């Protein structure tokens, strides 16, 4: 089975969250430009708005969110989860772990992909060296000939 | 207007650069005229003497060989090169004048370009 869905439909999600639709997190690190850094900063950067700016009631200020004000409050509250391995749950710790999990969920093929890439780049570089030698050997007859043409001007 | 290197510094520099390039590859400016290009150059080359046309072919072959080998003419023959010593422009002008006259009064083209 797949992961459960908290809401039956998008309209139900919007009604629950006051008109805001919490986007699917499967490809959130690839859907957003600079996805990993963006998600980590957005989760951890819940700061105070500058002077003169007033966010409309019901919203929370986030500098890294396009627009300034985001619908989710700060959920990565310090001491919200109890890790099963013995790691202190600080906001930065939870941010890094969640971004790692989301980045895996958005790209589960990274390890195999990188291994294949390294092997094939190396092997194809060797092939390129051999192909250059082959070309220089085939053309060596022409590129070193001496032709007498009976002309000067 | 008519801008020649005697009355134009920019034309002098242009001619100097062209002379340098042609001397590097050792081929006259008229050798760049492709017979397949115009078909008037083809006729003009058909009317020229065999010694001249053979010299043109030899110079072109030498230039192509130098181009393949990625080298230039040695400085001796480079100083012995004579670009812009034309051999074809007068004949080409005669051919084009004859074609213009024939077209102007009646006449069918003596030669035509295939499609394409």
């Amino acid at each position: 089975d797949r992961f459960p869905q908290p809401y039956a439909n998008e309209a139900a999600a919007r009604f629950a969250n006051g008109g805001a639709y919490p986007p699917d997190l499967s490809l959130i690190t690839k859907a957003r430009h600079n996805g990993q850094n963006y998600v980590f900063s957005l989760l951890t950067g819940y700061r105070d708005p500058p002077a003169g700016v007033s966010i409309r009631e019901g919203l929370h200020y986030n500098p890294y969110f396009p627009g300034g004000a985001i619908a989710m409050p700060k959920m990565l509250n310090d001491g919200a989860v109890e890790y099963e391995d013995g790691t202190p749950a600080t906001e930065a710790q939870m941010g890094k772990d969640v971004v790692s999990f989301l980045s895996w969920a958005a790209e589960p093929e990274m390890e195999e992909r990188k291994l294949m890439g390294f092997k094939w780049i190396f092997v194809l570089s060797l092939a390129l060296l051999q192909a250059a030698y082959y070309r220089r050997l085939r053309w060596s007859v022409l590129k070193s000939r001496k032709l007498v043409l009976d002309v000067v001007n | 207007s008519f801008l020649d290197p005697k009355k134009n510094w920019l034309a002098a520099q242009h001619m100097k650069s062209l002379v340098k390039r042609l001397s590097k590859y050792g081929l006259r400016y008229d050798d760049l005229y492709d017979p397949y290009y115009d078909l008037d150059v083809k006729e003009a080359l058909n009317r020229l003497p065999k010694e001249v046309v053979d010299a043109r072919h030899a110079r072109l072959k030498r230039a192509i060989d130098l181009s393949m080998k990625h080298e230039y003419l040695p400085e001796d023959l480079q100083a012995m090169q004579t670009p812009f010593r034309g051999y074809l422009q007068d004949m080409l002008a005669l051919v084009k004048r004859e074609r213009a006259e024939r077209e102007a009064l009646g006449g069918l083209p003596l030669y035509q370009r295939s499609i394409p």
Partner: peptide
Amino acid sequence: APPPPTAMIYDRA
């Protein structure tokens, strides 16, 4: 250095 048109039978032609 450049030969005159007197030499080079193709130049003469």
